[PDB]
Design a protein around this ligand. Sequence first.
Ligand SMILES: O=P(O)(O)O[C@H]1[C@@H](OP(=O)(O)O)[C@H](OP(=O)(O)O)[C@@H](OP(=O)(O)OP(=O)(O)O)[C@H](OP(=O)(O)O)[C@H]1OP(=O)(O)O
Ligand SMILES: [Mg+2]
Length: 168
Amino acid sequence: RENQVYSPVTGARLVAGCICLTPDKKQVLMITSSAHKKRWIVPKGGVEKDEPNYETTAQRETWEEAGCIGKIVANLGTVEDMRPPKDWNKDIKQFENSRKDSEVAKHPPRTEFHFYELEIENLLDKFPECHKRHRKLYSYTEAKQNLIDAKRPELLEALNRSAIIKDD
Ligand SMILES: O=P(O)(O)O[C@H]1[C@@H](OP(=O)(O)O)[C@H](OP(=O)(O)O)[C@@H](OP(=O)(O)OP(=O)(O)O)[C@H](OP(=O)(O)O)[C@H]1OP(=O)(O)O
Ligand SMILES: [Mg+2]
């Protein structure tokens, strides 16, 4: 329902989420997508009209989606879902070509993500989406492949900004 907050400039849906790392920073916590059960992503969701800051949304969604509690240790800034709309692929005008490069036809972002790095302090067996999702730790190498397979490079960008150890 329309508790959802949108960018006043681009109309993009405002979403906050967490890159949750182990204290030793060797693994990130990932969740299966609701719609597609074999796609691994990170906890995130729409900011609601009442919420005073993005941190609130981020920790609310990390609890609801992954039953994960911890402390925010870093602001990882913003990334955008630049997937085109659903009008695409049956459109006549689809790509815009340069001289030494090619691009998708100009469009506003679907979603503007505000990501935070969280140090995991606890994982609980019962959480709201307990029976709707799976939730597992993954090394950088394994996490990177998950987000490529999921078709979510913007979530990988968020992950790359974190203090996760990539040398493995
Ligand atoms: O298209 P869909 O309905 O199949 O689901 C998409 C997305 O729609 P879009 O990408 O076209 O905008 C959903 O947004 P909406 O449906 O609320 O508009 C989004 O929920 P979200 O943004 O996290 O919002 P919160 O409810 O957490 O606040 C959902 O994440 P999941 O929560 O895991 O399902 C996404 O699948 P993926 O993220 O890959 O798993
Ligand atoms: Mg969500």
